[PDB]
């Protein structure tokens, strides 16, 4: 009976709520009052990259903090030298509608995808002197929203059809899939150990998955609207998410509950991208109001504002070593802040 | 320094080549106009697409009018939700919206709601929408047959009066023209309530099998780009 199952679900949800409440004897905000505030943070654009024609939608930092990959809706994928601003490659994509890009941990492969439902992987070996498509991973029933590399042979991709899948580059077919979501999946983040990865969907719920076991482990909720971004805390025991409701929240896997939420009354625009510093003390989040903000994770106090962009800040990324922060926007320009 | 200079010169040469390629591609990118095709589920989008032409998530069609490059994209295998992937088409020259003038439900109300949502979107406020009222011939038969739909579900049609600005074609009775202009005014009310002035609507009465649809689209695009230029030069 549908009424019986839907009542058992309500009972289980109430029990889960009670269990979560029982563990909240104290709040992170109260305890953090003893921590010294970081104070105002000064950031300026040190390098500006130009060459894109359409709005930039995604970018990814390299593993050496030297090379980065930029994806634009023009259909061109460009790799830039951060220190010298010299372009190293210009890959003309088959489809102009791009929505994400990724850089392999070893730097030998680059991947991208979009509304075509196909994930294309490019090889930088260039034995013949040119970059060509290594393989295309078709099979998704919805637009590919985000993708990340576990290694040179394994890639995790997400699509706007409620399905997350793991692909084998050599064989070119899905190995396992996740179907716990109900709305379109917007972004995914891989844990430092690569064993676990989180994904956000357009239903205000964040799901935790096990790559090896291939099934959900924990479910997090609390957002008032769709989730647009997600990023793991550097220690890997927590992550932060951004949603259209203009409030960021931090979730802890061990506690199975949100520890703190970042919000400002004067801010009404939603969050587009989020990223943490090397130590995780500083949280950087992009906003639709043509600027980015830096949040003190422990005190929930805005320590600065980055307003060097003229249009929506679509992507934001922090180097592995934290030397500088690269941000992109719909004005076809990249701003690197240090 | 010699070893460092060896890499620096190669980097400079690569940058020069990439810059030349990007400059070459810029001309073709700027010389082509991007268009989005959208409409109801069972609308006549397919017939119009084939007329212009004569598992993938998106389809693209290329055509040229008066030596003007036109690039159009039709949404393919995509889920019913649109509030996320629609934001991508914010830089297109215009949005082509096709609604049938007739599992079936009150399609016209759903089309009105979808058009209002598209018009009121924050990122789409800078993009003009070209509106095509398709299946007008079927509307004529449905009106002349006695059995009626608009008069049943639309109550305001009874009190409606044909505008004096109407320019109906010969050989058609007052009823079909009145219904067509009532639908047109229903669309214009939503498209003009905001009064922002940044984007405008271009209604059209077109049949499924119509040869001059390409000319309609070309004229609308010319008008849109020209109006944008006048706005840029501070006139409008």
């Amino acid at each position, epitope marked *: 009976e549908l009424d019986q199952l839907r009542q058992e679900a309500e009972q289980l949800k109430n029990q889960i709520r009670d269990a979560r409440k029982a563990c909240a004897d104290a709040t992170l905000s109260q305890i953090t009052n003893n921590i010294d505030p970081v104070g105002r943070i000064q950031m300026r654009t040190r390098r500006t990259l130009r060459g894109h024609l359409a709005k930039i939608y995604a970018m990814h930092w390299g593993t050496d903090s030297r090379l980065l990959v930029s994806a634009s809706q023009d259909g061109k994928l460009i790799i830039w030298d951060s220190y010298t601003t010299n372009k190293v490659h210009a890959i003309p994509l088959r489809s102009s509608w791009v929505m994400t890009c990724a850089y392999a941990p070893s730097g030998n492969y680059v991947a991208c995808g979009g509304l075509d439902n196909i994930c294309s992987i490019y090889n930088l070996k260039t034995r013949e002197g040119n970059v060509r498509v290594s393989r295309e991973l078709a099979g998704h029933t919805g637009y590919l929203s985000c993708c990340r590399f576990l290694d040179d042979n394994q890639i995790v991709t997400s699509s706007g059809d409620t399905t997350c899948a793991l692909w084998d580059i050599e064989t070119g077919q899905q190995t396992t899939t996740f179907t716990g979501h109900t709305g379109d999946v917007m972004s995914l983040s891989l844990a430092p150990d690569t064993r676990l990865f989180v994904s956000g969907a*357009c239903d205000a719920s964040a799901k935790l998955w096990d790559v090896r076991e291939g099934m959900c482990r924990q479910t997090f909720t609390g957002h008032e*609207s769709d989730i647009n971004a997600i990023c793991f805390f550097p220690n890997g025991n927590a992550f932060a998410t951004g949603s259209d409701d203009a409030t960021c929240r931090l979730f802890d896997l061990r506690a199975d509950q949100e520890l703190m939420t970042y919000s400002h009354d004067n801010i009404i625009c939603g969050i587009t991208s989020v990223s943490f510093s090397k130590s995780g003390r500083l949280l950087l989040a992009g906003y639709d109001d043509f600027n980015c903000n830096v949040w003190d994770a422990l005190k929930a106090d805005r320590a600065g504002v980055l307003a060097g962009h003229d249009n929506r800040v679509s992507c934001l990324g922090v180097t592995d070593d934290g030397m500088a922060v690269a941000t992109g926007s719909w004005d076809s320009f990249l701003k690197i802040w240090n | 320094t010699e070893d460092q200079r060896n890499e620096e010169k190669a980097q400079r040469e690569a940058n020069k080549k990439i810059e030349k390629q990007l400059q070459k591609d810029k001309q073709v990118y700027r010389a082509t106009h991007r268009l989005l095709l959208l409409g109801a589920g069972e609308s006549g989008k397919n017939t119009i697409v084939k007329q212009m032409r004569i598992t993938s998530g998106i389809f693209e069609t290329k055509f040229q009018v008066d030596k003007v490059n036109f690039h159009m994209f039709d949404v393919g295998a995509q889920r019913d939700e649109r509030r996320k992937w629609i934001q991508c088409f914010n830089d297109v020259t215009a949005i082509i919206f096709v609604v049938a003038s007739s599992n079936q439900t*009150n399609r016209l*109300q759903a089309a009105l*709601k979808l058009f209002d949502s598209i018009w*009121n979107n924050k990122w789409l406020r800078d993009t003009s929408v070209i509106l095509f009222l398709n299946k007008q011939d079927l509307l004529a038969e449905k009106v002349l047959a006695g059995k009626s739909k608009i008069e049943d579900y639309f*109550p305001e049609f009874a009190r409606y009066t044909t505008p004096e600005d109407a320019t109906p074609e010969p050989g058609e009775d007052p009823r079909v023209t009145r219904a067509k202009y009532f639908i047109r005014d229903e669309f214009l009310r939503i498209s003009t309530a905001s009064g922002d002035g940044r984007h405008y609507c271009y209604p059209h009465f077109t049949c499924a099998v119509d040869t001059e649809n390409i000319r309609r689209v070309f004229n609308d695009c010319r008008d849109i780009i020209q109006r944008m230029h006048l706005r840029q030069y501070e006139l409008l």
Partner: nanobody
Amino acid sequence: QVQLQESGGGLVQPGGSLRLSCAASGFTFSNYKMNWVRQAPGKGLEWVSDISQSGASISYTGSVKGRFTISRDNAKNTLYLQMNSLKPEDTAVYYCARCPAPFTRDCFDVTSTTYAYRGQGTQVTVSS
């Protein structure tokens, strides 16, 4: 978690009246637009009416314009849809759905057969 619960409704002879109430929780009810949708048997979802955040702007479908009425009270996070003069075609399951984003007048995926931000709904039936 955000949850929308519909209440009221039932079997009623034609020409009667019914009261439907929607309960909102887990979010700021005053910052989101509210909509009413129904799904008749053997037919897809269809929009019925919507009310702005402050209630100043109210609209109804032509088939129900002048018959039904909707109102909201942010002090209780409740939304209402008053039905009167029932007709045999009114039989349908009514869902209380919320506009996806706040501080905006655009709502896209209210009735796209998969909207997560809507309640379970209640059955409304009419018979002689």
